[PDB]
Symmetry: C3
Subunit: 131 residues, 3 copies
């Protein structure tokens, strides 16, 4: 028999009806899309606060799933098509505060897309190893 | 070297590997609302149902299934209205009807190839 | 923690892990038509060829190769015409010239960073 994937919900991170928050399979963790919404369901104001909240959500989910930010292998970034050059640059400044070791930064891509209402940034396809 | 499969009952695109099996995991190429004969169905409803039928058949051909999907990505056409996006999600919940085991997902708008209203990509699933 | 590698013959971007190896699988950061010196090539063909050359070099550096790719995603610039997208796919079939082993693929238009006509992301490959 083969092992089942397991689906988890970190109680300190917002959970969306249509979206698996965390999946674990064969020592690997996958996350559903993460956005700058706190546990109370409040979307934070501006690129910076949405970015900080997004990576806080990711950190909490990964640690809940026996992983962590330093175990992320790959992730994708969707920035809103509405963002200015300064907002995109600020995102990357904040990104480097989350992943502070240049040598071990995870695989990344980043493109502009039309996100759901109010969203300035979304981080998707987070793949991480378990501890 | 990775094993590539083609389910005979699902459309196969020239440039696109349909199914890959690697170390008990199944990966799929992009899926759209085109049936076995190569006919693109009209409208979001029919395209959505056909897309997930394609995914289901591909996964079952590799002894996986919808219930063993860990993650997927959705691209909806930029042309879709809010009500169309809402309708997509209603249909999505009819495919994944067990709330607790819904796969990781993300959903954004994109400029898709001609005629396409929805595309589901990066489907990753475990073998049963 | 997972092993991150840098192939010294391929450009590395400040914010971007170039190569990650985990449990006999290789993941790549986004690849674009920029050479080792950091020069973005002019035109779709040269950017396309450079992008897949970068991918080839990274995979071979990580005990893998183009023939071990399981899945990848393509983002083409929204500025590209239909004829240019067709040209990209011709070039794609030159690189992946064995039809049966072409990796899982999806391809959509997106607004890429300055100057970029094509970007290949989410490359996942098995190790030898």
């Amino acid at each position: 028999g083969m092992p089942t994937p397991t689906f988890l919900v970190c109680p300190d991170v917002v959970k969306f009806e249509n979206v698996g928050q965390i999946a674990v399979v064969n020592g690997m963790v996958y996350l559903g899309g993460s956005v700058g919404i706190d546990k109370s369901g409040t979307l934070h104001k501006g690129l910076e606060e949405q970015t900080r909240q997004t990576f806080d959500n990711i950190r909490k989910c990964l640690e809940y799933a026996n992983s962590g930010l330093d175990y992320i292998v790959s992730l994708n970034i969707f920035l809103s098509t509405s963002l200015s050059d300064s907002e995109e640059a600020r995102f990357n400044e904040l990104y480097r505060e989350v992943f502070c070791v240049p040598a071990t930064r995870p695989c990344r891509c980043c493109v502009r897309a039309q996100l759901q209402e109010g969203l300035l940034v979304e981080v998707v396809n987070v793949v991480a190893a378990q501890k």
